[PDB]
């Protein structure tokens, strides 16, 4: 269906958009948002995934932008493929 293959086909502003959608529950059922957050994790590879959004670590800024500038750093620290060409 119209799913993305991994993070490496979002440019950052699209991934930002997907988290903003998620972080305001910008949809009609729960059973959407469980599948949106499962998509977020399996695309970006990051082990904790859902719990980063949902139970903030003290020291991090818990907003869509900040969550994405955490994903940015994570990827480049571990040495991963990164996003698309921004």
């Amino acid at each position: 269906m119209e799913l993305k293959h991994s993070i490496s086909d979002y440019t950052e502003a699209e991934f930002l958009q997907l988290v903003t959608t998620i972080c305001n529950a910008d949809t009609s059922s729960e059973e959407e948002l469980v599948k949106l957050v499962t998509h977020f994790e399996e695309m970006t590879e990051h082990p904790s995934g859902s719990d980063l959004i949902y139970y903030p670590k003290e020291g991090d800024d818990d907003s869509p932008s900040g969550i994405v500038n955490t994903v940015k750093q994570w990827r480049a620290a571990n040495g991963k493929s990164g996003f698309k060409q921004g």
Binding site: I22, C23, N24, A25, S29, E30, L33, V34, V37, T38, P47, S48, S50, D51, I53, Y54, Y55, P56, D62, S63
Partner: protein, 134 residues
Amino acid sequence: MESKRNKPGKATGKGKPVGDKWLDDAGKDSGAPIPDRIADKLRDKEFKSFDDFRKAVWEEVSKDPELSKNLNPSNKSSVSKGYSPFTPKNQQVGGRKVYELHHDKPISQGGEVYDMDNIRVTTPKRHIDIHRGK
């Protein structure tokens, strides 16, 4: 036949004197029971399904200033739209990521569904524990 949780009925309860840290305890013992603050608001209201019940409970969580306190914006919009908050990485079991309402008595052996004294807040890992895999 579909089991009698998806059918209309009256909500009954007293409810437990909890504290704000109540959501951490849903993976203890058998779950954390429903607070007295939510049950007071649901005292003999007609509901049309359990899900319709669940919507209200979660929302009274955002309208009660102590119960949604430990939540962040994303769980707080959830709760105030009637949907279950999520769990830590020790409690989300692959597919099952949200908080569920579960029961001290099995439905099939006389479990009162719409009676809040029997409805326990559980993490996925706990719902799965007492219902043995499924």
